[PDB]
């Protein structure tokens, strides 16, 4: 959580504060006149040392999920929370939909070098793919049968993984294994509990947050 | 591999299965087998045919259910069964009786041909004792029992030809012919014993056993072409290989099953193959043929890896036709091991193998038959 | 449970109690032994007729059926497969898996019925027993398939009626037999049952097959051809629900109402007034209850009549309304002197969604717990039972599985299946398994070794000891001392090992040789189980060393066995006599010191014989043979001592 917060805090300081006062006296002695220095120094904080260390943290976090059995419901909830905070590091910041962002020609969007976040998201997805059906089975089972908080976080994790899964491998697994049908069929069980929440003095709102997480995940699947 | 066996439910437990012997001059495949039952209200001996209805289709999956031809009531459990010849089946009973049945092919019936009602009994009480194993070398029959006795019969002789009284102080579980006048027995104290049937005394000629803790030995078979090579199976599920000329210890000890090993058989005409069955519900095929690639003397190639096992073998025995089962070279003895049945049968009590055909019987009240063992 | 106000089912036993004889009884593990008794000797008749018959009453004849044996082995494989899979699947995938498991159970029932049918055709004397078993298995598959639809598949409005039409079709075959006979006729349209075949297909919802029969009539009858075309068009246009359509139940109901108004308009216009059978089929399409009841004989069952009524009046029926229509259909179909059968109560309870009443009625009607045990297990995996423990500390699932497994333990080949059922009983299964394992009839060493492996895998150390002790006692009764000793050692019973060791020593005193040499030679660390077994194994080691010509070691061991007092006092003569050949050797084997110890052991025994002899038994012939043996021992000891002193004295220079 604090790693996700520190990376997001670095990204919010704009680059105008490294240009006033004290290193300008030692580099004036290599005279080579050739070519304008005008693009290569803009991105050197987050990107040159981070990728390998983050991929190791992801692998180890996925392995720690697989080592936890069905008895460790609170541990699982923390690990799904950790994985959601990790997946938030690779998230592109919401660019404002300015009228000028549409002046960027379709040509500049096809020839722009791949953004560092899209590289990290792809490399993270290749790591999820290396754990195969074992990780898919654990997350899908905890989304259907888990404890209230575990179900919510597993559904939020599925919403996030399916949002980045361009090959639709997780969607194909969820359909072919029947978990997508179990999640849909359980809406009839939620109906009985959701009716009780409309009373002036409702029970604990846990069923509402499970329903919201389930419907958010189904809404995500419906976008393809 | 599950698609190799036709399974027949028969509504009684099968203790024994044996193929009818085919003529060595016939290109005929074995099509007839016998079964014995146990732990039923009325035990029986049955004769079965494998169905041959002429599938001139190279592409239709074999669904030929075995058909019962005939049966006869058997007093007590069928503890062991062998064909004496094409027409005669010999049985050992839990009543201590040895019985010869005759199959009449013309009317598909069984009849009692001969019986020894007190083949096995405890000395001093005259109480019946189970006849636990029998072996045939036509016209000779040998039986062993829980009374520790060895009996010799001839199929046409009403009287027992010879009894070895007090041969063992323990239950004998298995018997096989080493030679025409020599047998091997296995017992409840983990001994393999060699007997000369012409010796007037009651002492074994040789006794073999494992070093350390002794477990019961249940089964024994002799390599068909190499009379000195013997296989045994026991209570710990272990396959033991013996050279009965070379020491009193097994030559090899192999993890074969997770429970009691009921039968071991070398393939009669292709003895680079061996078969075992167990209480664990498995039927294993062992293939030692991987070393029959004639030593094509060519070319050199280095590489090292260490793994420790202790064997003290002195370095002077001639390269005379190494039995694949006696090979001690960890770089040359690649045994291929295959479970032939799908996971989850009850006990596989018996197997028999003839040509391309294998039959086995189970406590799942089922007979399994294949006719394409090596396909 | 209020105690059942049902008179207990009287089982009349033919020939028992003829002549005012009292009945004696003994309970077995699943059988009742019955015998006649003379409970009152008033009168010295030494000719009182021996009880000539002992009756064995069996509660479960079905457990012994060769065909039902396949049912129990295949259903066990399905059951164990279900229990192993219980952890792996969530939501919709789990429901589809449980429906597949239900279908696997029904497939085994169907295969058993087909086999019984083929056997019934072959064998006239057993045919009646197979016919009654086929009827019971048909009632089980009928009710199981209904429970699959209502509880496991939990079929919603729409798909429900499609599944009920399929249910009736799978269990009511009479219409297909009628149509096959009609079609084998040279002229199918002139056949008496032709219109019964058309009407029967319409009642089953089989509009396409009814239309194929009507096409034959339209070809034969030029006058009926216009009416056949109208009726073919009505049957073709009939709205059917499909298990994958985008159609709403409301859009279906509107199309169905419009189609029904088209049927009614054709009837009111007198379109069919020249053909009573086409008019009757059109009235069936309108759901006319009088005409449906006139066709009772084509439906044969009230539940086929129910499904026909649902098809033509209530095609969008809800699960919650089924019981009302089922009850009404039963009452209308049974409106004469016919009482409801026990199967009707089961099917009504299923339509009421009362699973407890379905289980209860089947537990009364069935001889065997198989149906109720497996159906309840499968429905428990559907989470349909609340975790209410019964007043006896087990849930309903565990109770029915325990009784079913106990039933399997009564049978000589099926008791192994009962083991695995007890492992899936969490509260009482282990204690039931212990109790039943001790009661297994151990007729063979192979059966005992199987039972031991099962007990060892489950850490059942007391049952392992009990089984080994039973086998040791049976082997002892059979005069197999080596087998008895081996089983006693495995039991770790030191007292029983002592008793068997004393019998080996007695047999040696009588015969001069051991019967089971190889077992005693291989005792190893088990020799330490008792002092008497220690003595027996060391005394055998002495005979082995003596046979190997190791006379000095054998002499030292023999002396150690006497001095350690591990030898029983009755056997001390025999030990001293076995020292005679070593005392008489040309070489001095026993030292002067060792010879004095042997002399002391001889005198200690002579003293003990003087103390145990009350004065009145001095006069039977065994006293003289013992005295001659003692004189020989004294002479041999004196000769060894004289030689030992000379040899030891000659080595001290």
UniProtKB/Swiss-Prot annotation, chain C:
It is found in: Nucleus, Nuclear pore complex; Nucleus membrane. It comes from the Eukaryota. One of its GO terms (biological process) is nephron development. GO terms for cellular component: cytosol; nuclear membrane; nuclear pore outer ring. Its main location: nucleus. Pfam families: Nucleopor_Nup85. Signal peptide: none annotated. GO terms for molecular function: structural constituent of nuclear pore. Component of the nuclear pore complex (NPC). Component of the nuclear pore complex (NPC) that seems to be required for NPC assembly and maintenance. Involved in nephrogenesis. This is Nuclear pore complex protein Nup85. It comes from Xenopus laevis.
């Amino acid at each position: 959580a604090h790693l996700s917060q520190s990376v997001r805090t670095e990204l919010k300081q704009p680059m105008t504060a490294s240009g006033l006062g004290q290193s300008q006296y030692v580099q004036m002695l290599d005279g080579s006149f050739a070519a304008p220095p005008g693009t290569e120094n803009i991105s050197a904080g987050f990107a040159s040392i981070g990728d390998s260390s983050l991929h190791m943290i992801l692998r180890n976090l996925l392995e720690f999920i697989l080592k936890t059995g069905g008895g460790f419901q609170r541990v699982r909830a923390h690990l799904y929370g950790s994985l959601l905070y990790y997946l938030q590091i690779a998230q592109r910041p919401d660019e404002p939909d300015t009228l000028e962002s549409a002046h960027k020609s379709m040509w500049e969007r096809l020839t722009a070098p791949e953004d560092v976040f899209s590289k990290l998201q792809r490399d993270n997805l290749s790591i999820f793919e290396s754990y195969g059906t074992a990780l898919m089975e654990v997350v899908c089972r905890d989304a259907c049968d888990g404890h209230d908080i575990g179900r919510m976080l597993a559904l939020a994790l599925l919403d996030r993984i399916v949002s980045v899964d361009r090959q639709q491998q997780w969607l194909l697994y969820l359909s072919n294994s029947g978990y997508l049908k179990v999640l849909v069929d359980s809406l009839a069980e939620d109906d009985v509990v959701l009716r009780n929440l409309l009373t002036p003095q409702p029970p604990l709102l846990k069923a509402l947050y499970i329903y919201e997480s389930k419907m958010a995940f189904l809404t995500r699947v419906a976008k393809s | 591999m599950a698609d190799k066996f036709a399974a027949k439910f028969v509504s009684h437990k099968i203790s024994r299965t044996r193929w009818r012997p085919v003529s060595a001059s016939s290109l005929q495949q074995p099509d007839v087998f016998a079964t014995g039952s146990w732990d039923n209200e009325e035990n029986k001996v049955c004769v079965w045919a494998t169905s041959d209805f002429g599938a001139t289709s190279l592409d239709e999956e074999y669904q030929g259910d075995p058909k019962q031809l005939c049966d006869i009531k058997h007093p007590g459990d069928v503890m062991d069964m062998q064909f004496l010849d094409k027409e005669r089946i010999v049985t050992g009973s839990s009543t201590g009786t040895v019985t010869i049945f005759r199959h009449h092919e013309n009317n598909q019936t069984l009849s009692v041909n001969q019986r020894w009602e007190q083949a096995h009994y405890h000395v001093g009480s005259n109480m019946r004792a189970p006849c636990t194993a029998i072996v045939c070398s036509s016209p000779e029959i040998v039986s062993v029992g829980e009374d520790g006795r060895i009996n010799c019969f001839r199929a046409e002789s009403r009287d027992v030809l010879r009894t070895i009284d007090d041969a063992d102080s323990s239950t004998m579980h298995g018997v096989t012919f080493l030679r025409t006048t020599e047998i091997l027995t296995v017992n409840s104290v983990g001994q393999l014993k060699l007997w000369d049937l012409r010796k007037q005394g009651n002492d074994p000629t040789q006794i073999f056993s494992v070093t350390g803790e002794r477990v019961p030995l249940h089964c024994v078979d002799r390599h068909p072409n190499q009379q000195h090579v013997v296989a045994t199976g026991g209570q710990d599920g272990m396959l033991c290989i013996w050279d009965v000329r070379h020491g009193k210890m097994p030559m090899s000890l192999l993890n074969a099953h997770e429970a009691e090993m009921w039968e071991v058989h070398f393939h009669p005409s292709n003895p680079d193959h061996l078969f075992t069955c167990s209480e664990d519900g498995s039927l294993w095929h062992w293939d030692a043929s991987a070393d029959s690639e004639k030593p094509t003397f060519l070319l050199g190639g280095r590489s090292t890896f260490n793994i420790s096992r202790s064997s003290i073998a002195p370095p002077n025995a001639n390269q005379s036709l190494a039995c694949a089962w006696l090979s001690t070279d960890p770089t040359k003895g690649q045994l291929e091991i295959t479970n032939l049945l799908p996971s989850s049968t009850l006990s596989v009590n018996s197997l028999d193998v003839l040509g391309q055909n294998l039959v086995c019987g189970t406590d799942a009240e089922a007979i399994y038959v294949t006719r394409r063992l090596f396909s | 449970m209020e105690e059942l106000d049902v008179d207990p089912a009287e089982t009349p036993i033919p020939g028992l109690g003829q002549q005012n004889r009292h009945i004696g009884f003994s309970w077995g593990p699943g059988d009742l032994l019955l015998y006649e008794t003379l409970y009152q000797k008033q009168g010295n008749s030494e000719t009182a007729a021996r009880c000539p018959f002992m009756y064995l009453v069996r509660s479960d004849e079905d457990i012994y059926s060769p065909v039902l044996r396949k049912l129990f082995n295949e259903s066990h494989s399905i059951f164990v497969g279900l229990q192993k899979s219980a952890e792996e699947a969530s939501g919709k995938s789990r429901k589809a898996q449980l429906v597949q498991v239900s279908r696997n159970y029904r497939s085994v029932l169907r295969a058993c019925m087909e086999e019984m049918h083929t056997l019934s055709e072959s064998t006239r004397e057993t045919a009646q027993k197979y016919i009654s078993q086929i009827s019971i298995l048909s009632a089980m598959e009928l009710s199981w398939n209904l429970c699959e639809i209502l509880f496991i598949e939990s079929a919603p409005a729409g798909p429900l009626l499609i599944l009920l039409l399929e249910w009736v079709r799978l269990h009511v075959c009479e219409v297909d037999n009628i149509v096959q006979d009609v079609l084998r006729s040279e002229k199918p349209t002139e056949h008496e049952k032709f219109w019964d075949g058309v009407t029967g297909y319409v009642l089953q919802g089989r509009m396409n097959e009814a239309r194929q029969l009507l096409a034959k009539e339209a070809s034969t009858s030029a006058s009926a051809r216009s009416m056949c075309r109208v009726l073919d068009d009505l049957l073709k246009k009939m709205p059917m629900l499909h298990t994958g359509g985008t159609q709403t139940l409301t859009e279906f109901e509107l199309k169905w109402q419009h189609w029904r108004e088209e049927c009614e308009r054709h009837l009111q216009n007198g379109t069919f007034s020249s053909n009573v059978h086409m008019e009757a089929v059109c009235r069936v399409l309108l759901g006319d209850e009088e005409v449906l009841l006139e066709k009772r004989d084509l439906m044969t069952t009230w539940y086929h009549f129910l499904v026909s009524r649902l098809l033509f009046k209530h095609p969008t029926v809800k699960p919650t309304e089924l019981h009302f229509y089922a009850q009404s259909s039963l009452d209308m179909f049974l409106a004469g002197d016919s009482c409801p059968e026990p199967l009707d109560n089961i099917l009504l309870a299923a339509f009421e969604f009362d699973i407890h009443q379905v289980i209860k009625e089947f537990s009364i009607v069935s001889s065997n717990w198989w149906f109720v045990a497996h159906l309840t297990d499968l429905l428990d995996h559907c989470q349909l039972f609340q975790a209410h423990n019964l007043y006896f500390g087990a849930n309903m699932r565990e109770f029915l599985l325990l009784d079913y497994a106990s039933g399997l333990f009564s049978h000589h080949s099926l008791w192994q299946l009962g083991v695995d059922y007890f492992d899936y009983c969490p509260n009482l299964g282990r204690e039931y398994l212990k109790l039943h394992m001790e009661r297994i009839p151990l007729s063979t060493e192979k059966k005992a070794l199987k039972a031991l492996r099962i007990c060892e895998q489950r850490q059942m150390t007391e049952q392992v000891r009990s089984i080994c002790k039973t086998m040791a006692m049976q082997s002892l009764c059979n005069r197999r001392l080596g087998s008895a000793l081996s089983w006693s050692i495995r039991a770790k019973d030191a007292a029983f090992a002592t008793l068997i060791s004393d019998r080996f020593l007695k047999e040696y005193c009588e015969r001069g040789n051991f019967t089971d040499l190889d077992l005693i030679d291989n005792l190893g660390s088990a020799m330490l189980l008792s002092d008497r077994l220690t003595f027996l194994g060391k005394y055998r080691e002495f005979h082995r060393m003596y046979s190997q010509e190791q006379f000095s070691e054998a002499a030292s061991l023999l002396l150690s066995l006497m001095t350690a007092r591990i030898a029983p006092c009755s056997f001390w003569l025999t030990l001293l006599l076995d020292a005679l050949p070593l005392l008489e050797q040309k070489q001095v084997i026993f030292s002067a010191e060792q010879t004095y110890e042997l002399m002391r052991c001889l005198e200690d025994r002579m003293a003990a014989k003087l103390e145990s002899t009350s004065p009145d038994e001095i006069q039977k012939q065994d006293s003289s043979i013992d005295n001659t043996k003692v004189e020989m021992l004294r002479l041999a000891l004196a000769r060894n001592l004289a030689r030992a002193i000379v040899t030891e004295g000659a080595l001290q220079e």
